[PDB]
Amino acid sequence: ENLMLCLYDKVTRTKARWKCSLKDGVVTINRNDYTFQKAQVEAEWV
DNA sequence: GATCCTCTCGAACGTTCCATAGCTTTTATATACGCGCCTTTTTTTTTT
Numbered sequence: 001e002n003l004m005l006c007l008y009d010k011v012t013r014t015k016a017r018w019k020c021s022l023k024d025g026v027v028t029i030n031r032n033d034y035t036f037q038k039a040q041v042e043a044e045w046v
Numbered sequence: 047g048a049t050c051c052t053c054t055c056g057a058a059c060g061t062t063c064c065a066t067a068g069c070t071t072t073t074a075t076a077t078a079c080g081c082g083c084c085t086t087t088t089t090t091t092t093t094t
Contacts, residue, residue: 015074040084 002029006039018043 006025011018022039 003027004039006036016044018045 004022004025004027006022006027008020008022010021013019018041020039020041020043022036022041024037025039026033026035028034
């Protein structure tokens with residue numbers, strides 16, 4: 001259900017922006033299953 | 047001692063442990079300008 005089951009190792013933020021590095025996880029997205037080897041997530045907190 | 051004159055140079059020691067203040071903790075930001083190091087960019091390379 002759009003749930004990222006992984007392990008984070010690096011999250012860097014510069015006052016407005018995320019830089020999250022996720023590794024060796026399984027993601028299930030809307031009747032689809034996906035597993036990655038690396039994940040680089042950069043969110044934006046308002 | 048050992049002449050004479052010019053003239054040049056630089057209970058103390060441990061032992062325990064409270065008591066002072068700090069420090070360092072993140073995190074806002076302006077600048078330059080440092081490495082840092084990602085990633086793709088970009089090649090060089092190997093095989094078919």
